[PDB]
């Protein structure tokens, strides 16, 4: 981690100190080099405890002339890579190219440096510990620094361009996965022009992505539009409006298992949804939503709503009988107990209940069999934690399916307590009905906002109801355990004391007040303190902070709804059969450029 | 104060009026000087009732030529300082240097002015009455005005640079304690270059601060970064990212009693926390919080929370017995009285209560013995009033410790009434659990905000509940003291009338309404007026004003949380023993610049 790298760099500078040749390479004394390379008895493979050579030290400090004296002294010093643990394959050519030193890279290439050296150490692998990820070929280093003359010089003596890293990423993948500059686009055009002809544009990595798909996933909209300029084809410019024929071979991907749309909307990176605002794909996903996705989603929502009315009606009509044993007990009310299963179904209305309960359990197993391969296909933490893919709605529909299957289990095996899974099944399924509210323009963004307020604001005052109401319910319990709980049984015992203080803390019950009897003077001052620092201070501060966080979230919230409609369009596709979703676009074997399906857009510009 | 200075300046101008020589020095008549200095019988030590000399008057109005005629008349006039009460040591050299008059300071230095004159009056001491604090040496005046040629001229004829004021501040301290300019930095470099070698950089004042520490305390981030440029040491610039080896001798201060971090975060000045955003100290305190401060704080959170569950459980299980004397009284309920101490502990569960009560009282004395030297070390008003150091949380934990010790006292001495200290002990300790909630990213800033809303907004409507509900409870008491309290005992008597109007003013109880009987016509119109100007007007205006003050406070609130995590990092350090906190950084005896501990940072720039 950080301290290990600090220890490595400290040991590196210690080994710069104790060896005088590395000191002379550092400070450019220009005397001690001549004596310590004038002799020929000792081999000049002097390395540090880190493992770098002296030519690495000469390249490291932009020291050209001293490095010319070392390459005069030994030609083989550019040949060997460093034997370090973080720098396990870094040669002096890498330091030469990444410092953009022209005479140094010319001289090192003239003496015969290794043009293909895989620097596969931990300090050069893609990691959040490293500030940059530039690959490990010198070609990738020259491509990342943007210097066109150096990468031209490296191509003109070798450096095959389709060389990959340990992650399978080619050099164009490393051009994608960068902070965006205006200096990385025209030299990407240079690298595409040097391809000279399977191609470099369509090579995948070990992650399974094309450079186009990595442009989609990583949120690079500039290179997305710039590479869209190659696939596009204009038609005519008859007037101010022009026509444009975009290509959807790698966008829609009708014959591919991993669709590009599923990779762009289900991305961990935040910027990928901005690619959803670009005109070659926004019009495609809007046409797919308007023509097909919205009415099939409305039919699916209506079928789910009628299924939930059927489950609720079969839930209210649960079989009950009168309580056989007498109560003989105050502070205890039950009047209706649950019938046994063998005596449950004896009437015609029991069969009417039974057919709808079978519809309920078959709807549950359809939900389970439809959702379980989506857990087993997508990464499960990525499937569950992402709010874009309906992750919370997926875990509450699976909790609903689990508790209704548990309800079926404890109905087949006669034992009391179906209220315990069944009430949670009712409330979780009816809160899972809000999953089908994202297809509507008015209901959807509010559902996004309540998902953000559940995931961001609810736990903050779960942990700040509890810290207040524990002490205040304990205070009310102490001031009221010396009194009669017959006339005021508000804080009679501790769980009802916490539950009463929780109710009154949200002001959903009246404060306890009795005027036929007297109350202790401790209760009045403790209750007054509770009414000050509980119901005036906290909830009005949520009015303030929920207003402020809604003002902060709303602008990206609307575009987040416009991303979840894309997710609903794609995930609602490829689950329903292929006959009911035709391939969108037009057949392209009439224009004159192949057999690839296209999308035509009208665009009235300035 | 202000009016005393007005009287001094009025008496000064009166003594300018009555003496014609000072008038001739003012308006440049160039005649009356020649007659009134042509004679030699009278000594020219004519001073005002304020006490300034005539050469002070000649320097005061940028009057060079008249001052040349006075120094031709008398050479000794530059020697004597003014004998004033506010200007007790101000010489004419001071007026010459602070007006930036080049020929005047050249002529006054040529005639032999006192280059070291301590002007230790009340008008030149550091005070909020004075608009400026420029020191009292002429060197400090030349240093404050920024004129490099004048301070060069003052050094070239004397003016030893390490001269201090009455507060012990040297000249570099006066360069720190200024409004920030771009004109005070390069001439601070000039004064550092004129130091020519213990040094002026490390000399302290009577307040005990280095110029670096005074740069930290006073909020001068520009000179902090500028003086950090001297301590820093780069390593290499291999690529776009560079390494930087900062020095932490005077920052972390492992061997110093008064740490620089404790002086910068516990500062009365607002701007000092902006120094907490600078990269040589932000990375250090973030590494100290992430590596060590956060898990020890979480272990302290778990220990304090389990201790409070133990105290609450031993509080609920308080020993009680049935009431021995009969009640014989309506409007009076008690059923359980407190047992005596000799009959309190007779069961095994009483021993289970007793061991947790001992854990409670030893936790109280650990809290007291841990916090009392922090009162006796830090300034007590500065320790108590500061929200950065957890001042309100400290006074509520000490109120908790005092009332639980009082509860132990009235348990050892048998007397009734443990509910009154014990309920406040419960609520104050459980509200003091929120002191440990600032180490989390989500809970912390909300705790900052509720601290600000107690300290700024809660008294504003303590004094505006009371002014409304006193008159309205009196109105309800007048309209309901002529009626039967059996049918409606809401406002039966005046303390219950105020408490009922206080409850209904926050709408935590229902309005009193009876329909089996009749209510007076006055109550309906008074209650309608209360419902208009009490629950619609006020509490919605706290919605509005709390939203507005949240939008004003939030931006500096988040950085205030990022400062209080620094305060918790430093204060949580040096209280636990030294073996649990290793010295942060790396040992610097391998680079080549000494035996001082360093901090290494990676910085990827543009």
Rounded Cα–Cα distance for residues A202 and B425 (Å): 71
Burial of B519 (0-12, 13-18, 19+ CB in 10 A): middle
Nearest residue on chain A to B457, alpha-carbon basis: A537
Write phi, then psi, for B241 (nearest 5 degrees). Answer: -85, 140
Burial of B511 (0-12, 13-18, 19+ CB in 10 A): exposed
- State which H helix or E strand residue B338 sits in: strand B336-338
Q: What is the DSSP letter of B441?
A: T
Rounded Cα–Cα distance for residues B120 and A411 (Å): 94
Find out whether B120 and B88 touch, Cβ atoms under 8 Å: yes
Query: Which residues are within 8 A (CB) of A399 and not within 5 positions of it... i.e. 6 or more apart?
Result: A424, A428
Find out whether B340 and B414 touch, Cβ atoms under 8 Å: yes
Find out whether A354 and A346 touch, Cβ atoms under 8 Å: no
| Angle between the N-to-C axes of helices A348-377 and A294-316, in degrees from 0 to 180, rounded to the nearest 10 | 140
Buried b (16+ CB within 10 A) or exposed e, A301-336: beebeebbebbeebbeebbeeeeeeeeeeeeeeeee
Q: Which of B534, B475, B548 is nearest to B505 (CA)?
A: B534
Rounded Cα–Cα distance for residues B11 and B17 (Å): 10
Rounded Cα–Cα distance for residues A385 and A268 (Å): 10
Residue B340 CA, chain-centre distance (Å), reads 49
Q: Which of B284, B281, B275, B173 is nearest to B220 (CA)?
A: B275
| Long-range CB contact pairs, B512-518, < 8 A, 24+ | B512/B488, B514/B487, B514/B488, B516/B487, B517/B487, B517/B488
Rounded Cα–Cα distance for residues B119 and B137 (Å): 7
Q: How far apart are the first and last CA of chain B?
A: 53
Q: What is the DSSP letter of B290?
A: I
Rounded Cα–Cα distance for residues A41 and A350 (Å): 103
**Residue of A57, A471, A523 to mutate, testing the B interface (most B Cβ within 10 Å of its Cβ):** A471
- State which H helix or E strand residue A242 sits in: strand A241-247
Find out whether B215 and B169 touch, Cβ atoms under 8 Å: no
Find out whether B349 and B389 touch, Cβ atoms under 8 Å: no
- Out of A482, A538, A543, the one facing B336 most closely (by C-beta) is A482
Task: Tell how strand A241-247 and strand A598-604 pair up.
Answer: antiparallel
To the nearest 10°, the Cα dihedral for B394, B397, B401, B403?
A: 110
Residue B39: both structure tokens together: 């004679």
Q: Which of A97, A33, A14, A96 is nearest to A63 (CA)?
A: A96
The partner residues of A243 in beta bridges, in order of sequence, read A602
User: In a 3-state reduction of DSSP, which class is residue A322?
Assistant: strand
Q: Which of A272, A559, A277, A301 is nearest to A439 (CA)?
A: A301
Residue B485: list chain A partners with CB under 8 A. Answer: 515
To the nearest 10°, the Cα dihedral for A53, A55, A57, A60?
A: -130
DSSP letter for each residue of B137-153:
SHHHHHHHH--HHHHHH
> Rounded to a whole number, what is the distance in Å from the CA of A474 to chain B's nearest CA?
7
Map tokens 């015969």 to a residue. A112
Q: Which of A7, A84, A126 is nearest to B600 (CA)?
A: A7
Map tokens 């095959």 to a residue. A160
The verdict on a CB contact (< 8 Å) between B604 and A520 is no
Rounded Cα–Cα distance for residues B317 and B62 (Å): 84
- State which H helix or E strand residue B598 sits in: strand B598-604
Q: Which of B317, B377, B376 is nearest to B347 (CA)?
A: B317
Buried b (16+ CB within 10 A) or exposed e, A262-292: bbbbbbeeeebbebbeeebbebbbebbbeeb
**Residue of A540, A546, A552 to mutate, testing the B interface (most B Cβ within 10 Å of its Cβ):** A540
- Residue A348, number of CB atoms within 10 A of its CB: 7
Task: Tell how strand B320-322 and strand B336-338 pair up.
Answer: antiparallel
User: In a 3-state reduction of DSSP, which class is residue B219?
Assistant: coil
Rounded Cα–Cα distance for residues A483 and A492 (Å): 9
The verdict on a CB contact (< 8 Å) between A541 and B453 is yes
Q: Which of A519, A369, A271 is nearest to B496 (CA)?
A: A519
> Rounded to a whole number, what is the distance in Å from the CA of A489 to chain B's nearest CA?
13
The verdict on a CB contact (< 8 Å) between B446 and A545 is yes
Q: What is the DSSP letter of B586?
A: B
Buried b (16+ CB within 10 A) or exposed e, B246-257: bbbbbbbbeeee
Rounded Cα–Cα distance for residues A469 and A494 (Å): 12
- Residue A420 vs residues A186, A360, A410: alpha-carbon distances, Å: 65, 18, 11
**Residue of B314, B585, B602 to mutate, testing the A interface (most A Cβ within 10 Å of its Cβ):** B602
- Residue B167, number of CB atoms within 10 A of its CB: 13
Q: Which of A343, A456, A436, A355 is nearest to A393 (CA)?
A: A436
To the nearest 10°, the Cα dihedral for B497, B502, B505, B509?
A: -80
Residue B326: both structure tokens together: 């009969």
Find out whether B416 and B410 touch, Cβ atoms under 8 Å: no
How many beta-carbon pairs under 8 angstroms link A with B? 197
Rounded Cα–Cα distance for residues B108 and B68 (Å): 9
Find out whether A136 and A165 touch, Cβ atoms under 8 Å: yes
- Out of B446, B495, B549, the one facing A460 most closely (by C-beta) is B446
The partner residues of B337 in beta bridges, in order of sequence, read B321
Rounded Cα–Cα distance for residues A159 and B439 (Å): 52
Task: Tell how strand A320-322 and strand A336-338 pair up.
Answer: antiparallel
The verdict on a CB contact (< 8 Å) between A478 and B419 is yes
A72 Rama class: left (phi>0) / alpha (psi -120 to 50) / beta: alpha
Residue A122: both structure tokens together: 């931990």
- Out of B316, B431, B550, the one facing A468 most closely (by C-beta) is B431
Rounded Cα–Cα distance for residues A365 and A415 (Å): 23
Q: Which of B501, B429, B543 is nearest to A538 (CA)?
A: B543
Task: Tell how strand B241-247 and strand B598-604 pair up.
Answer: antiparallel
- Residue A249, number of CB atoms within 10 A of its CB: 18
- Out of A2, A537, A548, the one facing B551 most closely (by C-beta) is A548
Rounded Cα–Cα distance for residues B420 and B136 (Å): 59
Query: Which residues are within 8 A (CB) of A525 and not within 5 positions of it... i.e. 6 or more apart?
Result: none
The verdict on a CB contact (< 8 Å) between A467 and B430 is yes
> Rounded to a whole number, what is the distance in Å from the CA of B359 to chain A's nearest CA?
19
| Long-range CB contact pairs, A399-403, < 8 A, 24+ | A399/A424, A399/A428, A400/A364, A400/A367, A400/A425, A400/A428, A400/A429, A400/A432, A401/A364, A401/A367, A401/A368, A403/A428
Nearest residue on chain B to A476, alpha-carbon basis: B423
Rounded Cα–Cα distance for residues B580 and A401 (Å): 50
| Long-range CB contact pairs, B178-186, < 8 A, 24+ | B178/B144, B178/B220, B180/B220, B180/B222, B180/B223, B181/B146, B183/B146, B184/B146, B184/B223, B185/B222, B185/B223, B185/B226
Map tokens 């022209």 to a residue. A102
DSSP letter for each residue of B68-102:
HHHHHH-GGGGTSPP--SSSSS--HHHHHHHTT-H
The verdict on a CB contact (< 8 Å) between B335 and A520 is no
The overall longest dimension of chain A from CA atoms, in Å, is 111
- Out of A7, A483, A504, the one facing B333 most closely (by C-beta) is A483
Q: What is the DSSP letter of B241?
A: E
Residue B103 CA, chain-centre distance (Å), reads 45
Query: Which residues are within 8 A (CB) of A280 and not within 5 positions of it... i.e. 6 or more apart?
Result: A228, A231, A232, A246, A251, A599, A601
Binding residues of B: 510
Q: For chain A, state the CA radius of gyration.
A: 35
**Residue of B287, B313, B333 to mutate, testing the A interface (most A Cβ within 10 Å of its Cβ):** B333
Q: How far apart are the first and last CA of chain A?
A: 53
User: In a 3-state reduction of DSSP, which class is residue A413?
Assistant: coil
> Rounded to a whole number, what is the distance in Å from the CA of B383 to chain A's nearest CA?
24
Burial of A547 (0-12, 13-18, 19+ CB in 10 A): middle
What is the SS3 assignment for B489-520? CCCCCHHHHHHHHHHHHCCCCCCCCCCCCCCC
| Angle between the N-to-C axes of helices B494-505 and A521-533, in degrees from 0 to 180, rounded to the nearest 10 | 20
User: In a 3-state reduction of DSSP, which class is residue B380?
Assistant: helix
A230 Rama class: left (phi>0) / alpha (psi -120 to 50) / beta: alpha
Q: What is the DSSP letter of B357?
A: H
Binding residues of A: 510
- Residue A40, number of CB atoms within 10 A of its CB: 8
What is the SS3 assignment for A429-473? HHHHHHHHHCCCCCCHHHHHHHHHHHHHHHHHHHHHHHHHHHHHH
Q: For chain B, state the CA radius of gyration.
A: 35
Residue B428: list chain A partners with CB under 8 A. Answer: 471
Residue B543: list chain A partners with CB under 8 A. Answer: 540, 543-544
Rounded Cα–Cα distance for residues A311 and A89 (Å): 65
Query: Which residues are within 8 A (CB) of A409 and not within 5 positions of it... i.e. 6 or more apart?
Result: none
Task: Tell how strand A336-338 and strand B598-604 pair up.
Answer: unpaired
Query: Which residues are within 8 A (CB) of B551 and not within 5 positions of it... i.e. 6 or more apart?
Result: A548
The verdict on a CB contact (< 8 Å) between A132 and B547 is no
Find out whether A284 and A584 touch, Cβ atoms under 8 Å: yes
Query: Which residues are within 8 A (CB) of A268 and not within 5 positions of it... i.e. 6 or more apart?
Result: A382
Find out whether B284 and B265 touch, Cβ atoms under 8 Å: no
Determination technique used: cryo-EM
Counting Cα atoms < 13 Å in the Cβ hemisphere of A502 gives 14
- Residue B215, number of CB atoms within 10 A of its CB: 28
Find out whether A78 and A58 touch, Cβ atoms under 8 Å: no
Residue B234: both structure tokens together: 């780069």
Find out whether A337 and A348 touch, Cβ atoms under 8 Å: no
- Residue B86 vs residues B50, B90, B224: alpha-carbon distances, Å: 9, 9, 34
Residue B479: both structure tokens together: 């309209």
Positive or negative, the CA dihedral B115, B121, B123, B124 is: positive
Q: What is the DSSP letter of B436?
A: G
Rounded Cα–Cα distance for residues B398 and A469 (Å): 21
Burial of A339 (0-12, 13-18, 19+ CB in 10 A): middle
Q: Which of A174, A28, A153, A157 is nearest to A97 (CA)?
A: A153
Rounded Cα–Cα distance for residues B603 and B240 (Å): 9
- Residue A285 vs residues A263, A357, A571, B243: alpha-carbon distances, Å: 14, 38, 12, 47
Q: Which of A58, A116, A61, A127 is nearest to A89 (CA)?
A: A116
Q: What is the DSSP letter of A46?
A: -
Residue B425: list chain A partners with CB under 8 A. Answer: none
Residue B420: list chain A partners with CB under 8 A. Answer: 522
Residue B424: list chain A partners with CB under 8 A. Answer: 475
Residue B453: list chain A partners with CB under 8 A. Answer: 537, 541
User: In a 3-state reduction of DSSP, which class is residue A366?
Assistant: helix
Query: Which residues are within 8 A (CB) of B328 and not within 5 positions of it... i.e. 6 or more apart?
Result: none
The overall longest dimension of chain B from CA atoms, in Å, is 111
Q: Which of A382, A393, A540, A371 is nearest to A455 (CA)?
A: A393
Find out whether B192 and B212 touch, Cβ atoms under 8 Å: no
> Rounded to a whole number, what is the distance in Å from the CA of B13 to chain A's nearest CA?
57
Query: Which residues are within 8 A (CB) of B359 and not within 5 positions of it... i.e. 6 or more apart?
Result: B307, B310, B311
Rounded Cα–Cα distance for residues A25 and A17 (Å): 11
């Amino acid at each position: 981690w950080e301290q290990y790298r600090d220890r490595v760099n400290m040991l590196q500078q210690e080994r710069i100190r104790d060896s005088p040749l590395l000191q002379a390479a550092k400070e450019n004394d220009l005397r001690l080099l001549k004596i310590l390379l004038l002799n020929q008895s000792c081999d000049f493979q002097q390395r540090g405890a880190v493992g770098e050579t002296a030519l690495h030290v000469a390249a490291l400090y932009d020291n050209l002339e001293a490095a010319t004296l070392l390459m005069e002294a030994a030609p083989e010093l550019a040949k060997e890579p460093a034997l370090c643990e973080p720098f396990v394959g870094q040669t002096a050519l890498h330091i030469a190219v990444m410092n953009q030193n022209l005479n140094l890279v010319r001289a090192l290439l003239a003496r015969g440096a290794s043009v293909s050296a895989r620097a596969t150490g931990a300090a050069f692998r893609r990691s959040p510990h490293n500030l940059i990820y530039y690959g490990e070929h010198p070609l990738s280093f020259a491509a990342c620094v943007g210097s066109e003359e150096i990468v031209r010089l490296l191509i003109e003596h070798g450096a095959d361009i389709r060389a990959q890293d340990s992650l399978g990423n080619t050099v164009l993948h490393i051009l994608i996965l960068q902070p965006n500059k205006t200096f990385a686009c025209q030299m990407y055009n240079l690298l595409l022009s040097y391809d000279e002809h399977q191609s470099l544009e369509l090579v995948p990595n070990h992650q399974g992505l094309t450079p186009f798909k990595l442009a989609g996933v990583e949120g690079n909209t500039v290179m997305f539009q710039h590479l869209m300029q190659k696939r596009k084809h204009v038609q005519w410019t008859c007037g101010p409006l022009t026509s444009t024929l975009y290509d959807l071979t790698e966008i829609d991907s009708w014959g591919e298992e991993l669709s590009f749309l599923e990779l762009v909307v289900s991305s961990k990176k935040r910027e990928a949804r901005q690619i959803l605002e670009q005109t070659p794909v926004k019009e495609l996903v809007s046409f797919k939503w308007k023509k097909y996705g919205r009415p099939y989603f409305c039919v699916l929502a209506s079928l789910y709503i009628l299924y939930m009315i059927c489950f609720t009606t079969c839930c209210i009509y649960r079989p009950l009988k009168l309580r056989d044993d007498n109560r003989t007990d105050p502070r205890d009310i039950t009047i209706l107990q649950q019938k046994l299963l063998q005596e449950a179904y004896v009437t015609h209305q029991d069969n009417i209940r039974l057919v709808g309960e079978l519809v309920t359990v078959t709807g549950a197993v359809i939900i389970l069999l439809l959702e379980i391969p989506d857990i087993f296909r997508v990464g499960a933490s990525r499937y569950f934690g992402q709010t874009i893919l309906g992750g919370p709605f997926h875990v509450i529909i699976i909790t609903y399916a689990s508790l209704v299957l548990l309800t079926m289990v404890m109905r087949l095996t006669n034992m009391n307590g179906e209220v315990v899974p069944l009430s949670f099944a009712l409330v979780l399924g009816w809160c899972s009905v809000m999953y089908f509210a994202r297809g509507f323009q008015m209901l959807g963004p509010f559902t996004i906002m309540i998902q953000k307020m559940i995931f961001g604001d609810l736990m903050r005052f779960c942990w700040l109801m509890a810290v207040v109401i524990l002490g205040f319910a304990s205070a009310f319990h102490i001031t009221f355990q010396t009194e009669d709980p017959n006339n005021l049984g508000e804080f009679s015992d501790y769980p009802t004391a916490l539950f009463s203080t929780f109710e009154l803390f949200l002001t959903i019950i009246d404060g306890p007040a009795n005027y036929s009897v007297d109350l202790p003077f401790m209760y009045c001052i403790t209750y007054a303190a509770f009414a000050i620092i509980a119901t005036l201070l906290m909830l009005n501060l949520f009015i303030a902070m929920m207003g402020d966080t809604h003002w902060r979230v709303a602008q990206e919230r609307d575009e987040l709804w416009r991303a979840q409609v894309v997710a609903t369009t794609v995930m609602l596709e490829r689950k329903m059969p292929r006959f009911l979703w035709p391939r969108s676009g037009i057949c392209g074997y009439e224009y004159g450029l192949g057999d690839r399906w296209f999308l035509r857009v009208e665009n009235h510009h300035d």
